[PDB]
Design a protein around this ligand. Sequence first.
Ligand SMILES: Nc1nc2c(ncn2[C@@H]2O[C@H](COP(=O)(O)OP(=O)(O)O)[C@@H](O)[C@H]2O)c(=O)[nH]1
Ligand SMILES: Nc1ncnc2c1ncn2[C@@H]1O[C@H](COP(=O)(O)OP(=O)(O)O)[C@@H](O)[C@H]1O
Lengths: 350, 396
Amino acid sequence: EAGDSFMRDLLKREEELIGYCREEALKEPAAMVEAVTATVWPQNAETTVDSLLSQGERKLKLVEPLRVGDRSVVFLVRDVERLEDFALKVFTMGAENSRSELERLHEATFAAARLLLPSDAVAVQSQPPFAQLSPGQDDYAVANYLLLMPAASVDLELLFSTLDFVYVFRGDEGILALHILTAQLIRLAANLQSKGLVHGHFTPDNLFIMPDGRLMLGDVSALWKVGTRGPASSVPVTYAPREFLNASTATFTHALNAWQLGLSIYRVWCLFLPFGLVTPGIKGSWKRPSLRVPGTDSLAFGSCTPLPDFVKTLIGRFLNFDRRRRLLPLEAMETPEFLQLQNEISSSLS
Amino acid sequence: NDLPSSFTGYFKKFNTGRKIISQEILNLIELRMRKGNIQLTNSAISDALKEIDSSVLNVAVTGETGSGKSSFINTLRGIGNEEEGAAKTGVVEVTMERHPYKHPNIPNVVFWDLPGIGSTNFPPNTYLEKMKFYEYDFFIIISATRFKKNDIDIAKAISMMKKEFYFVRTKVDSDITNEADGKPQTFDKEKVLQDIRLNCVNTFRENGIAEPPIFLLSNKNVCHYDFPVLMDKLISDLPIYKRHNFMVSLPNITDSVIEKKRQFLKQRIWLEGFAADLVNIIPSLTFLLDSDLETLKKSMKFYRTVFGVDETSLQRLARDWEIEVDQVEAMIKSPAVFKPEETIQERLSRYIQEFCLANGYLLPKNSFLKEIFYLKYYFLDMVTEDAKTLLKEICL
Ligand SMILES: Nc1nc2c(ncn2[C@@H]2O[C@H](COP(=O)(O)OP(=O)(O)O)[C@@H](O)[C@H]2O)c(=O)[nH]1
Ligand SMILES: Nc1ncnc2c1ncn2[C@@H]1O[C@H](COP(=O)(O)OP(=O)(O)O)[C@@H](O)[C@H]1O
């Protein structure tokens, strides 16, 4: 709670800068943003939708675009008659089976529903759900399936890119923020572990600081029961350890999230990924596509922020290439290094 | 009233740290002057000047790729990044070997671009050994945008050897513009600078290093930030005999830097004037042989170059203000001196009267420097003023 409130206040402090970088991030995909916006909101700021679940009819007012993903745009919207703001995720259709994939995503998400959960799923009125939405624009087909969720204050990917632009985390407060994020990441991963759960996408673009300062993990459809077998391709290649790159089908394990946890803590202190892995939107990044391509498999901290040794050690232990010897997050919290992290945070806060 | 006293007394009029020679050398020259052996007096002055002229300065610059090492080196050399002889980025990181870059006008001032430690497979202590740490007069860690672990590991290693380094934070103009663009409702130029500075200070302390000299500057705008104070600190850390060469090589970025160059060069004129023999005739009643005129023209050209008002320097200014050189030349005095209605002979005669009216003959009654040396003092004042005049334009 103490750390949450500190993060909340820090977010408010950097609110204008985050907003600036958020807008900057939308310039490159402007054509996509405009085309998706024109599809979902072809008249003015409001569009009327029906819930696919029990929620009935809503009018969603566009406030502003928030973020672009590989095949999606996320908008800040308002349901005026409920007095509630939401993030709304809208999906583009490249694939011929985009429709069936989204139907599958819907079922997996809501069957499954620290975790950012959806609030509702809706479809534009007078048009079939999942099918391509009218009015169509040729460069960007949009599916009639809109996912409503609480809006994060910032995702870690955008935070890192913002810090790369101007490193506002200076002095003991910025350093403390790095400590708190490190501790939050570890506890989030530890919480999953405690429930025998594994997420395929424990990555900065799926890690969200909420308005109350809490760090949450998104996309409950990618949560697995530990030991479950699934498509290895569901793990982003730059966030996949070697054992997820050698097969069509992989076992989803606590070792996977130990690895991904190591990556994210490394990025907290370094901004780019380790091992020369390509990290879009960060200047210091090399171009290694994945670990299956040979490169620097040694863990290098030279171009990072000067991180404390207790953090270095924890990253090193999470990023053990041996899938049988990675430090798991619950175990990590019992280490002296985690104790030291907690005491640095406690001393600095009070 | 005695000549050796007048000779030493001139130097006492300059503040400690502005003296071109040590007390020991001054004592030796004064001693020989008192003993009346002119030949040994000359040789003492000659030796001192030669020791000064042949002094070599080796300045190391380390830091991450893209931190502004080559830019920093070029700025101190008064060379644009795209001009000939400019240090270029990236190259040292490939060779993994230091590369020397000489100052164009004072070639005994040498800057060494060092590869970032991360471009090598050297741990800090090995990296310092391989880069020949002990051979440098100054070792400068350049850092931009954010402190890297490598920067602090190198610093910790140097502190472990109980040696010294300077920390230079580049691209502060970029951080300022970026925070101004990103947070206008709360942006404050002075606060951003202070917070960058304290972050540097705090980073060293937190890592067990006594805070080194720290300088926040911009290779893109020398008219502001810590460039002047950096220069002050570097020269102060040098033995006296190396000061002249470093000083005259410095970019002409403040009135203080310019004035300080004038002070050093005034002492050089005094030494040269005494080495040449004092005379017993007033300089308004002597004339210049062609050998003197030649020495004068070469003196003016050296001064103009030192102070950045030489032909090449003026041309560069002209392109950038987008004008004809004759518009730049017209703002100052030195370019017209040896140019075609009052003859050159009348003109130099007038300069003597003006100088000696304003300043006297600098010496006990009935003793004088040779006329050429009053002229050099006059030229030095003129070139100094010319440099301040143009700097006012540039830094604005
Ligand atoms: N705005 C600004 N840019 C700088 C400064 N110093 C260097 N740069 C720029 O940063 C980039 C890298 O600098 P450079 O000297 O070439 O890097 P290095 O030799 O590899 O350390 C170049 O595009 C420079 O123009 C500075 O003080 N301010
Ligand atoms: N509820 C939310 N609030 C704020 N940003 C979000 C939210 N959900 C997703 N995002 C952001 O929108 C972008 C795309 O989200 P998503 O569709 O989950 O990823 P992708 O499309 O890249 O698979 C990402 O940057 C993500 O961080």
